């Protein structure tokens with residue numbers, strides 16, 4: 230067909246329907262949302278990426294990059310059938326490392342586990358990114374990237390010092406603080422909007438030698454306990470929590486909430502740093518035993534797998550997810566949250582679900598040392614990052630009536646807050662919002678600048694997906 234012929238003439242490898250490569254590359258991480266691209270360009274070089282974009286232009290197609298394919302909305306496909314899909318996951322190398330500056334150049338199909346493995350094993354270096362080893366560098370870094378080092382060292386995006394980008398017109402350009410700084414600003418938080426990143430240029434830190442994983446089983450058996458407890462954790466997060474502590478409250482057992490965390494220091498140093506919160510928690514919590522880790526052991530520890538060096542996709546899932554970023558959860562917000570928690574959520578027994586309340590902001594959070602004005606990322610004024618997750622078996626159909634579960638929980642918080650108090654996080658992409666509403670909540674106070682930037686770098690909407698920023702001049 231026209232697109233196949235076009236790709237072939239340009240020397241761009243293409244997946245053939247019916248082959249193993251096609252079957253692998255076309256599989257969404259969220260099998261709730263499969264999409265059928267018109268063709269899959271399995272790129273090996275920056276030139277292939279540029280050729281693919283060129284082919285999209287001449288055949289008037291929409292083009293979408295897929296890196297680790299972890300988009301909760303399958304946006305790597307385009308969020309709909311019929312795009313040219315630029316499949317990036319064979320481009321996995323740390324192109325170069327500079328031992329004078331600590332800057333690594335990295336290909337856009339490297340997964341977080343593979344990246345961490347190469348930087349640590351080969352160079353003794355580390356970056357602050359997410360926990361899941363199969364996640365793509367590109368989708369992740371482009372929109373933020375939060376994990377168990379973000380309090381200490383900031384977002385994955387905060388490591389970005391430069392990018393090589395393929396634009397909607399197929400030109401290759403460099404972006405950094407001193408070259409195309411407007412484009413650089415957009416890539417660092419809304420990067421799916423402005424081109425396909427071909428090379429990430431990343432600042433690293435020495436791989437930590439002394440880390441302690443900690444956990445506390447909270448044992449909140451009623452509404453009172455959970456209200457008092459979430460309050461105690463916010464206060465600590467807002468005012469006390471030292472730089473070295475990274476943690477969240479999570480519940481993976483429909484009523485068995487815990488704190489899990491990573492501390493930059495010894496077990497004794499953690500205990501002293503956390504003790505003020507321990508003194509305010511409702512009585513009946515149990516401090517679980519600590520685990521002493523080095524950098525690469527910690528990556529493995531929070532993995533949920535027996536290895537981390539992933540160069541292929543991780544097992545697919547079948548789910549819906551939502552998110553919230555909040556200034557505070559105090560007042561009616563936490564009251565409504567806890568009611569719903571016990572009256573509704575804890576009686577949902579037919580599938581696996583979770584929430585995570587991430588300590589994202591607060592006084593000593595590195596995330597918060599960058600303003601909303603400095604990069605595309607719009608949540609620098611938010612203490613909490615919240616994930617809600619609703620997962621069925623792969624052989625089951627996600628039922629239409631099941632959406633209202635996470636919808637209800639999110640509403641219970643939002644109805645209690647002014648609109649300026651909360652947003653949503655595009656790395657926990659929720660496709661059940663129209664283009665205008667979603668970009669309002671994903672990008673906050675930065676949306677007006679993003680729209681103007683979009684009208685400069687993608688006026689035709691070549692990179693269209695249902696939740697892309699609108700080009701507005």
Ligand SMILES: *Cc1cc2c(nc3c(=O)[nH]c(=O)nc-3n2C[C@H](O)[C@H](O)[C@H](O)COP(=O)(O)OP(=O)(O)OC[C@H]2O[C@@H](n3cnc4c(N)ncnc43)[C@H](O)[C@@H]2O)c(*)c1C
Pocket residue numbers: 258293294295296297298299300301303304305306317337358359360361363364365366367368369371372373374375376420421422424425426427655656657658694
């Ligand atoms: C599946 C999964 C996701 C997780 C997990 N844990 C996370 C955590 O510890 N911290 C977080 O902050 N987020 C976590 N997430 C969510 C993921 O971070 C997001 O789902 C990321 O967006 C995933 O990125 P990726 O795997 O690369 O997703 P894609 O579906 O390929 O792309 C998403 C988005 O990005 C665009 N895009 C891809 N590639 C490029 C390039 N090269 N240039 C520009 N834009 C690109 C896509 O088109 C799409 O729009 C844990 C788990 C298990």
Ligand SMILES: *[C@@H]1O[C@H](CO)[C@@H](O[C@@H]2O[C@H](CO)[C@@H](O)[C@H](O)[C@H]2NC(C)=O)[C@H](O)[C@H]1NC(C)=O
Pocket residue numbers: 448450451453454512513
């Ligand atoms: C919620 O649960 C907690 C403990 O799980 C309750 O506190 C316990 O119950 C009574 C009343 O305070 C005390 O005699 C116990 O010793 C408490 N146990 C612990 C471990 O502290 C609390 O009362 C409950 N709140 C309610 C039911 O409203």
Ligand SMILES: [K+]
Pocket residue numbers: 265266267310311312
């Ligand atoms: K198609």
Ligand SMILES: [Zn+2]
Pocket residue numbers: 343346347538539540
């Ligand atoms: Zn590897």
Ligand SMILES: [Zn+2]
Pocket residue numbers: 460461464
């Ligand atoms: Zn308080």
Ligand SMILES: [Zn+2]
Pocket residue numbers: 535536
């Ligand atoms: Zn293994």
